[PDB]
Amino acid sequence: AVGRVVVLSGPSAVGKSTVVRCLRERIPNLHFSVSATTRCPRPGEVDGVDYHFIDPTRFQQLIDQGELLEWAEIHGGLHRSGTLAQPVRAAAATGVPVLIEVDLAGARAIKKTMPEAVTVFLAPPSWQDLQARLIGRGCETADVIQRRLDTARIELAAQGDFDKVVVNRRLESACAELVSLLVG
């Protein structure tokens, strides 16, 4: 039986990371997609675990050869990152569940290159919930905050493009629904 491939996305700052650690603890053999990158390893990073560290040129080949489900310029083109197709495919073929965490542009991209992946939008339990998180301690300027609220509204409007919507009402219930998606 082919492993399920789930693509997890949502608004920047909806609390995506916290759900991700829950899923990793709750599913022992879950394959968390390890992004390819062209930047250099920081100390303590392991190739094949934190990232697949490949050089700019080899990365360009992979792009050209259709080997990336998604890729993007990082820091305006300082370097690139993306999701390699092969390990996802090899994982699913071995029957292990696969989780890929990306931004909305990345999830959109992956749908085209791998339509059998299940795209999931992690939604806030309400607008006010999200707005409270975005204002947070109010350490940022009005302009920045206005910009964030506008970005949130645009991202939220995208949620219809996704295969599934998971409402982040409660960590454990959000986590639970995702587990149900990943393991058949």
Side-chain angles (χ1 to χ4, degrees):
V2 176
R4 197 85 100 288
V5 181
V6 173
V7 173
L8 209 227
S9 197
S12 351
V14 75
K16 213 160 69 198
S17 168
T18 342
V19 170
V20 168
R21 57 190 279 84
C22 173
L23 282 172
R24 293 187 74 179
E25 280 151 20
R26 269 134 95 147
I27 301 164
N29 70 326
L30 168 67
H31 182 64
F32 188 60
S33 184
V34 180
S35 289
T37 200
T38 64
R39 76 155 168 77
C40 296
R42 308 171 184 164
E45 289 186 335
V46 183
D47 194 17
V49 172
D50 291 276
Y51 288 91
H52 288 286
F53 299 95
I54 71 168
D55 87 84
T57 308
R58 176 49 177 163
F59 195 93
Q60 186 56 75
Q61 281 162 41
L62 291 170
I63 293 158
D64 290 336
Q65 292 165 19
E67 287 277 40
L68 278 297
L69 301 175
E70 58 85 25
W71 68 270
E73 303 288 351
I74 314 287
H75 300 298
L78 181 67
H79 68 95
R80 298 167 167 171
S81 296
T83 302
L84 286 162
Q86 252 313 108
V88 168
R89 289 182 184 289
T94 311
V96 333
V98 179
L99 183 71
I100 308 166
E101 180 183 13
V102 291
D103 62 22
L104 301 166
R108 228 171 290 290
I110 294 178
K111 196 57 186 182
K112 291 143 73 60
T113 64
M114 193 173 205
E116 70 279 12
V118 178
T119 57
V120 182
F121 189 104
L122 187 60
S126 65
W127 168 261
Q128 265 142 349
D129 201 269
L130 183 45
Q131 179 183 290
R133 289 183 179 102
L134 287 172
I135 296 177
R137 302 283 297 259
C139 286
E140 320 197 271
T141 68
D143 310 276
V144 171
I145 301 173
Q146 183 68 76
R147 174 172 170 151
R148 296 201 188 295
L149 299 178
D150 286 347
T151 301
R153 281 191 192 91
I154 295 147
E155 296 172 337
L156 285 171
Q159 79 183 251
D161 309 329
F162 284 63
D163 294 323
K164 291 282 194 317
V165 174
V166 166
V167 179
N168 195 8
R169 273 168 202 117
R170 174 64 190 267
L171 166 66
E172 303 99 309
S173 68
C175 189
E177 286 192 53
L178 279 156
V179 164
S180 282
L181 288 169
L182 278 153
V183 295

